[PDB]
Amino acid sequence: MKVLVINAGSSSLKYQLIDMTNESALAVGLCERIGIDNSIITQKKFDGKKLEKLTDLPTHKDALEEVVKALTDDEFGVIKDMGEINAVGHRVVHGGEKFTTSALYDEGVEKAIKDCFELAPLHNPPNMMGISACAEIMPGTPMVIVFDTAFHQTMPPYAYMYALPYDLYEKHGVRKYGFHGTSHKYVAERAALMLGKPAEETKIITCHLGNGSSITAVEGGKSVETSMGFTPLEGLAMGTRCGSIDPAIVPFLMEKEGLTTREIDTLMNKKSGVLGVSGLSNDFRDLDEAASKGNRKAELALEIFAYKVKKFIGEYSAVLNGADAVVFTAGIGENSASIRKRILTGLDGIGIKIDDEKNKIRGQEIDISTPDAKVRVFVIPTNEELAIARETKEIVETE
Amino acid sequence: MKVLVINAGSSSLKYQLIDMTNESALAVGLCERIGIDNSIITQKKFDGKKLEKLTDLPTHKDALEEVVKALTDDEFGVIKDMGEINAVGHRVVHGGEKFTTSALYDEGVEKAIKDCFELAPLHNPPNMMGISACAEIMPGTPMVIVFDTAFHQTMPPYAYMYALPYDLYEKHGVRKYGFHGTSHKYVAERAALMLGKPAEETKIITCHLGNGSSITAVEGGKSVETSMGFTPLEGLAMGTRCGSIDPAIVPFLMEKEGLTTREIDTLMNKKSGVLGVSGLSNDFRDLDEAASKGNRKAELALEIFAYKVKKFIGEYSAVLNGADAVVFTAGIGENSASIRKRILTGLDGIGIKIDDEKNKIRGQEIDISTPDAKVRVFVIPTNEELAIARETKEIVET
Ligand SMILES: Nc1ncnc2c1ncn2[C@@H]1O[C@H](COP(=O)(O)OP(=O)(O)O)[C@@H](O)[C@H]1O
Ligand SMILES: Nc1ncnc2c1ncn2[C@@H]1O[C@H](COP(=O)(O)O)[C@@H](O)[C@H]1O
Ligand SMILES: [N+]
């Protein structure tokens, strides 16, 4: 069986065709600037051959057609016809209270996603677009949905409950959810393996740092606590997200600037984070370079980001009464060695120590902590696509 | 030195005269029913002698001129003339920026106190009715203003700034200020003495647990991080406060419930906390009972509260790169061996352990941790008036 995993964003679309027979990633591509000028799609074959097509991509639909065209490229493709795509896995951030486990797509599931648009303004609408593009290009192909909140469902009440009037939890299902679950679960299993101990016996602090970032306290292979909550805004500072700020600032900023609830939401989700502090951009790579060239703002922005990650690391050490290892994955966590250093410096007092040199290695699963450090520090590249393709393989077969 | 600590109120006036030589409270009083009927002033002298005088107290200025009569009483007083009162210290919760240290009241220091009203969403603006009194009743005498937010002015930028648009900090002052400064500092000083080392060489985690709660990371005697922020709302769940929740919830609630800005703020500061969860009381002592009596919501509210505090202990363990001791103060922190247990259990992984027997003791400086524990856990009662007295003294010296 072959599965196309889809990851949609407002104007981007990450895809990946995986051969479930030997779980090999036949091809990995990306569509950018969907809706802007100079639309483009890049693809990389398992043999290295790369493709790039400059062609206007107005909607996620057009891009999904170019995707099928790239996948079936006579020489740079990996298949002959669209029919070779047996199923399609989709990433969906919020499924709501009702949907928290991978599920075959149906009118009902589509209802829950849209209904949750307000719970994940930056992701669900775009994920939904990908799902639609999909239905407009390959209607006959089975579709499975995998939710970011799934993995965090084993949290205890004293953790997912907010200290608000109890009726809010009943009247509106307002509780902590968490996201990036599918990623936190994958790298967590990887850590258990690099530890040599069985999952049930390990205590790990997984760190997903990308456009969005979140930490999770995995005990015995199960999420017991996570940085994000009701929505993907709570927690760490991110690309354009403010994270856990004093809530009183909302009403305050609303009165002082006379902003509407809609506006204060867009401000917290699209104009804050490192973008808001740096005043430069949301790309941590850009910020890294700009900070190293003398831009105080970019410097301050990354300073706030690493420090916040550091505090959460200490915060989950108490939760787990001692963590065996800390895991860095995702865009920033896998590639950035500099930001990683910023996050881990000054933590030898809680067992964390790292080899500055081994820490300079590229994208490789490796222990970057001193061999004597009580706490291991793995840099594990994430692979949600496989996690999603695996989930998609099961649902479609098990009826 | 002899300091007079005052605490103005709606129609009351609490005060204390402390001899800084032995930091002993010579006398302590309270003027009740001010600006109304049945005006009364009650003073207690150290050697068990209480005075109750029914003089009428129109304006606070008279309530202070009476505190003079009482402090100088032939038999119930403690001083001959008003001249023995070297300085006067009053506490003001909101100190905001500017005031990185206590300020010796004058014309300037009063402006910033009045200026900071609409520039901050605090509920109880400075009751200057107390300070005003001193302005006249006691002219040639240093009057110090101790701010509950100053102690945190040592926080670095990457800590007090929020990951919000920079313009907000620059044009509206949005940053983390923190509160309970005097208490955290007082207990942080006591902790260093208990560790038997200079404050400078100590890293301490101070915990102020009361109706309102906050945690402060103390590095070398200076505040470097604290749980509350722009307002007392941020941080832990408290008696009626929700603390740091997902910000998205605010605009969400306002939409679903059709609330106003002022309404949503009231819901988070007064209708939330352990009160909102248990739906019983904002009082922990009563919740502790209900809890052991099988009250679910009650039990749930205590788990959330203790858990949060725990999360902050580890969070600050990373900030201070290892803490030497954790301090518990304030009402819940001084008298609840129940909650302290909920908080400290399951932390041997980060070097924290407690002696159940030593944890039963109420109100008294003591190390309740085990002798093998790497992190000392002290129980230190906080003395607000003496804390403001110490503070007032130092500003009077330099
Ligand atoms: N080498 C790098 N240096 C700095 N930041 C990086 C680097 N690689 C990735 N990042 C960060 O990760 C972001 C995207 O990561 P992520 O959200 O995981 O998406 P994706 O991995 O699909 O690009 C980039 O915009 C940047 O902020
Ligand atoms: N013995 C106790 N056990 C549990 N809670 C207590 C006890 N004594 C006081 N409290 C709580 O601690 C807080 C002290 O308030 P404050 O003095 O303002 O810090 C109040 O909200 C009380 O309910
Ligand atoms: N307050």
PDB file of N, CA and C and ligand atoms in Angstrom, chain B residues 210-211 283-285 330-332 335-336 362, ligand 2:
ATOM      1  N   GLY B 210      -0.922  32.475  49.711  1.00  0.00           N
ATOM      2  CA  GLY B 210      -2.031  33.070  50.436  1.00  0.00           C
ATOM      3  C   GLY B 210      -3.249  33.199  49.538  1.00  0.00           C
ATOM      4  N   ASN B 211      -4.163  34.126  49.832  1.00  0.00           N
ATOM      5  CA  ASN B 211      -5.339  34.270  48.970  1.00  0.00           C
ATOM      6  C   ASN B 211      -4.833  34.481  47.564  1.00  0.00           C
ATOM      7  N   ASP B 283     -11.470  29.917  50.360  1.00  0.00           N
ATOM      8  CA  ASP B 283     -10.667  29.651  51.550  1.00  0.00           C
ATOM      9  C   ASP B 283     -10.099  28.236  51.518  1.00  0.00           C
ATOM     10  N   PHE B 284      -8.776  28.121  51.509  1.00  0.00           N
ATOM     11  CA  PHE B 284      -8.133  26.815  51.453  1.00  0.00           C
ATOM     12  C   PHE B 284      -8.379  25.961  52.680  1.00  0.00           C
ATOM     13  N   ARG B 285      -8.331  26.567  53.861  1.00  0.00           N
ATOM     14  CA  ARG B 285      -8.571  25.807  55.077  1.00  0.00           C
ATOM     15  C   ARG B 285      -9.927  25.094  54.997  1.00  0.00           C
ATOM     16  N   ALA B 330       3.655  32.930  53.976  1.00  0.00           N
ATOM     17  CA  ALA B 330       2.272  33.389  53.852  1.00  0.00           C
ATOM     18  C   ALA B 330       1.325  32.360  54.482  1.00  0.00           C
ATOM     19  N   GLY B 331       0.059  32.747  54.615  1.00  0.00           N
ATOM     20  CA  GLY B 331      -0.940  31.896  55.249  1.00  0.00           C
ATOM     21  C   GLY B 331      -0.964  30.408  54.953  1.00  0.00           C
ATOM     22  N   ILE B 332      -1.067  30.051  53.683  1.00  0.00           N
ATOM     23  CA  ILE B 332      -1.102  28.651  53.316  1.00  0.00           C
ATOM     24  C   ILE B 332       0.273  28.046  53.548  1.00  0.00           C
ATOM     25  N   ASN B 335       0.964  27.715  57.639  1.00  0.00           N
ATOM     26  CA  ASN B 335       0.122  26.837  58.442  1.00  0.00           C
ATOM     27  C   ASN B 335      -0.453  25.588  57.783  1.00  0.00           C
ATOM     28  N   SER B 336      -0.136  25.317  56.528  1.00  0.00           N
ATOM     29  CA  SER B 336      -0.726  24.130  55.924  1.00  0.00           C
ATOM     30  C   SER B 336       0.238  22.997  55.592  1.00  0.00           C
ATOM     31  N   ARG B 362       3.559  24.319  62.976  1.00  0.00           N
ATOM     32  CA  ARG B 362       2.980  25.516  62.359  1.00  0.00           C
ATOM     33  C   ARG B 362       3.693  26.792  62.777  1.00  0.00           C
TER      34      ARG B 362
HETATM   35  N1  LIG C   2      -3.992  26.340  58.759  1.00  0.00           N
HETATM   36  C1  LIG C   2      -4.326  26.573  57.439  1.00  0.00           C
HETATM   37  N2  LIG C   2      -4.563  25.566  56.483  1.00  0.00           N
HETATM   38  C2  LIG C   2      -4.888  25.835  55.198  1.00  0.00           C
HETATM   39  N3  LIG C   2      -5.068  27.081  54.690  1.00  0.00           N
HETATM   40  C3  LIG C   2      -4.832  28.060  55.607  1.00  0.00           C
HETATM   41  C4  LIG C   2      -4.507  27.922  56.990  1.00  0.00           C
HETATM   42  N4  LIG C   2      -4.342  29.149  57.657  1.00  0.00           N
HETATM   43  C5  LIG C   2      -4.632  29.980  56.635  1.00  0.00           C
HETATM   44  N5  LIG C   2      -4.954  29.387  55.396  1.00  0.00           N
HETATM   45  C6  LIG C   2      -5.300  30.037  54.118  1.00  0.00           C
HETATM   46  O1  LIG C   2      -4.200  30.825  53.680  1.00  0.00           O
HETATM   47  C7  LIG C   2      -4.594  32.170  53.242  1.00  0.00           C
HETATM   48  C8  LIG C   2      -3.816  33.171  54.079  1.00  0.00           C
HETATM   49  O2  LIG C   2      -4.213  34.454  53.576  1.00  0.00           O
HETATM   50  P1  LIG C   2      -3.136  35.658  53.694  1.00  0.00           P
HETATM   51  O3  LIG C   2      -2.842  35.829  55.148  1.00  0.00           O
HETATM   52  O4  LIG C   2      -3.831  36.803  53.091  1.00  0.00           O
HETATM   53  O5  LIG C   2      -1.886  35.265  52.910  1.00  0.00           O
HETATM   54  C9  LIG C   2      -6.247  32.319  53.439  1.00  0.00           C
HETATM   55  O6  LIG C   2      -6.840  32.336  52.063  1.00  0.00           O
HETATM   56  C10 LIG C   2      -6.578  31.007  54.286  1.00  0.00           C
HETATM   57  O7  LIG C   2      -7.709  30.309  53.811  1.00  0.00           O
END
